[PDB]
Design a protein around this nucleic acid. Sequence first.
RNA 1: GGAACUUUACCAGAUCCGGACAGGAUGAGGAUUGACAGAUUGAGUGUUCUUUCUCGAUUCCCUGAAUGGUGGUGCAUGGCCGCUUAUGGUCGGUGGAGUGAUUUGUUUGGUUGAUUCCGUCAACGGACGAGAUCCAAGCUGCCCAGUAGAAUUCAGAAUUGCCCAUAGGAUAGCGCAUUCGGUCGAAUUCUUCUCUGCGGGAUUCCUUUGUAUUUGCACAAGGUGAAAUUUUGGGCAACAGCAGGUCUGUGAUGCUCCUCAAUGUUCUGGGCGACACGCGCACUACAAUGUCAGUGAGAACAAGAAAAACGACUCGAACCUACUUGAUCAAAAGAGUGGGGAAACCCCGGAAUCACAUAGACCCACUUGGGACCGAGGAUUGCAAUUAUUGGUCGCGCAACGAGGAAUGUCUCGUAGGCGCAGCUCAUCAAACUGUGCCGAUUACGUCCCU
Lengths: 212, 56, 100, 102
Amino acid sequence: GPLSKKRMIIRDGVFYAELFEFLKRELAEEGFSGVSYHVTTLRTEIVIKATKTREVLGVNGRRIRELTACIQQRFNYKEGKLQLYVERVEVRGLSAMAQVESLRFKLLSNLQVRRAAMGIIRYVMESGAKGCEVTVGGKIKGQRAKSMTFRDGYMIKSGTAHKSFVDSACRHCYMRAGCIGVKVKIMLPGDSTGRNGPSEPLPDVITVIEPK
Amino acid sequence: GHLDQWRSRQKIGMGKGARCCVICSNQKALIRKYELNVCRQCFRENAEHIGFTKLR
Amino acid sequence: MSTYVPKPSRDNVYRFFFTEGVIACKKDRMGTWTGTLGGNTFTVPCIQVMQLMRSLKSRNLIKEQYAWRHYYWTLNDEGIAYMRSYLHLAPSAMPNTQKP
Amino acid sequence: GQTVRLTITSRNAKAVESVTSQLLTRARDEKVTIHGPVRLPTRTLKITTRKTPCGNGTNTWDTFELKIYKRIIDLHAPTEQVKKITSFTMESGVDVSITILD
RNA sequence: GGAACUUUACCAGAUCCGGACAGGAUGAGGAUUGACAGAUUGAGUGUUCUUUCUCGAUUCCCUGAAUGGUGGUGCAUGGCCGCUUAUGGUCGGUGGAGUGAUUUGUUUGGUUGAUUCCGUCAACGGACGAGAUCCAAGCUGCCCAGUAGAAUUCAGAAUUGCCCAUAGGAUAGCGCAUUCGGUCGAAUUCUUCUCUGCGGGAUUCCUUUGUAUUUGCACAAGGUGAAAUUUUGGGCAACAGCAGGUCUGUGAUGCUCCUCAAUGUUCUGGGCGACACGCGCACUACAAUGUCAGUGAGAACAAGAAAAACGACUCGAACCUACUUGAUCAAAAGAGUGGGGAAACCCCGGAAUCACAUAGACCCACUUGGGACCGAGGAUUGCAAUUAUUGGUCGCGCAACGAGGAAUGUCUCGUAGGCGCAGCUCAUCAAACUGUGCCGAUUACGUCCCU
Ligand SMILES: [K+]
Ligand SMILES: [K+]
Ligand SMILES: [K+]
Ligand SMILES: [Mg+2]
Ligand SMILES: [Mg+2]
Ligand SMILES: [Mg+2]
Ligand SMILES: [Mg+2]
Ligand SMILES: [Mg+2]
Ligand SMILES: [Mg+2]
Ligand SMILES: [Mg+2]
Ligand SMILES: [Mg+2]
Ligand SMILES: [Mg+2]
Ligand SMILES: [Mg+2]
Ligand SMILES: [Mg+2]
Ligand SMILES: [Mg+2]
Ligand SMILES: [Mg+2]
Ligand code: NA
């Protein structure tokens, strides 16, 4: 043998990291937004978050069963011991992973960088985010590489609280000239529900309750 | 006998040549603590998913 | 190892590939790949599985995905038709990923 | 008299405390004898590595830490009753192990 | 990036195709694969020949294009990191001012580490950065312990009073005397110590026959207190950039180079370690605030074993360690018997700096300082130890070095310095790094002379 708790935690983390990488590469064009797994004695239940759940499932769940076969064979799960579920993200514009994939798709379609980046920002700010900051870099215009950033609204950079209020994701775009990096940051609106927003007040914001 | 010679030393399974990153299969600067077997550069990218955090 | 794939080993891999529409194999030349075919386990070297799947991919019969030293080959509709003719199965035969 | 030990282990402090409290409340509902819960020492997995991918620049380091929280609850209850107490939905990342003390 | 092989990218050779696929030849009257023996050979390597067997349609033969590459180009790139830059910096909107580039905002004054605040004001409103947030450490509450302990009862066992040493000082005690973690005793009672999830606690809070004071923002001493100023130490850290580094992390990547006697891949052997020399960092010293020999008391972070495989039939073994033997005679070994998945075994974690009224040896000398170089024996890790792998033993010590010119590094409190220990690299090897604890100061708490 029984592995120690340290070894068990390391093993579980490595399993999640490999599962995340496999789904990130497999579901790149379906707006993959995250993955969580719940382990019981009966089965291991894996829930995939995506924007286009129809493409993640496929006809009669052909795609989702193919992904189940991949995970089951790689990790040697037995029959009936592994299950996959697909749920949609409530707000796509508040997911950095979904938006950075959308930006990469738009760039791969020969769209201008200014157009695609501003399109992402307008969509994100319409979704209720406090702020969005997307940046595109590398061989944008010609042989010399330059980096250009587009931002709107609020954004916190320092401290440890931005790990909770800021959603980030970076992707590589493979163009004819070379590799283009796209990074999208979303300032999540603090919402009392934990699905979209840390639900905590901002670390430096002080509110005085109005008297009765 | 070229099948017996082929990768005969790699079958011994000792030293840095027998070990590689579980992500990138590189045989240099391998983190073997807690049986991670992950390259140092690959660990910095995947540390958040594995569960490690930067605190102090 | 040797890339030369015995014909019975190819038939076993293809039968497994059709039964479970996905094959996952670690990319290590001196490694062994294990699969289950209607009970029991048959072993093929990982390099030979890689060779068979590389041939299929060059003919656009499968889709290949790679992550963390592992391949993930999935039969395509053309690949399903190819395996159904190769394995001499009935037209009603389908991989488990397509059964209701 | 059978004594059964429940070990709750996770790397999330909030999850392990929530599971422990739920187990404790359910165990008190079946009015069984409780010993604990005991907050065992929390272990910090520590990995320090260079920040640069190359070898250039000031030798700066990143200290990554993983904390493991473990709790033990001893129950004087039959295996059927301890299964009933355990029978609920737990948070993800929390490992609960059941063992019968010698 | 502590390279024996591998790693490895270099050198001398020798294999394999890991050239998919397509098109065209041959082709079950056989496309092809693999080999015993004897030669070739570094090879008891079918790599090639002689010789035939073997496998069967997977290949092979030719053209194209693919593939792989620690090949180039970091001056084509992504990502990451470093640096400018540890300081207090940065940017719109609308408004004002200029033909404009631009400017105001963003400020003369005081204050703060702070573009931190208070005032002032052609601005007003905001956004970052600073602060706040976060993680540890110090004090503390609740909760908690068959993985931490304590106290008290009985029961067992031990010392027990006259004693003053080879010369024997100084240092508490003067209703019930102490001690025994194997006494591998048995029961009650508890959380003081330990463990810890969420809390509490500190903020210029209180004072001043202080400073400064229209005010304000504040400062200095002293209280309170575990802690008295960003509590302490870290992490994070804007906007602009640099042709800084990385194509030797990746199935990151454009172009280009090689591609079947290959720059792919594997195997054998060398090299990365070579030494008239120069330079940067570290270790050990030059001794008596010492070296030996003995004895005592005594930490904290931490690490520990395996599979879709091997044997039994889910379990065992790998990893760490304790105890015992080896031992009717060196170390290092070698062996058993247990334990530990790690608050459970190691472990009451007997670290050494340190201490010793040890009545110990040495006595100022390159000397019992120093331990570099080198010689013989033996053991261990490994498939392989020669170019000593690494310990252990006896020798060498006559190798310099007796405190180091000009120059130069780091540092303000549990800090410098000194001392070890663990992790990490790791089959074996630490003078490295990342942490940890132990003994613990001098000096200043200032300035803009130098940078
Ligand atoms: K004007
Ligand atoms: K600047
Ligand atoms: K010696
Ligand atoms: Mg801020
Ligand atoms: Mg800060
Ligand atoms: Mg070699
Ligand atoms: Mg490469
Ligand atoms: Mg550069
Ligand atoms: Mg760059
Ligand atoms: Mg200005
Ligand atoms: Mg000042
Ligand atoms: Mg000022
Ligand atoms: Mg590496
Ligand atoms: Mg070198
Ligand atoms: Mg000496
Ligand atoms: Mg080093
Ligand atoms: Na390149």
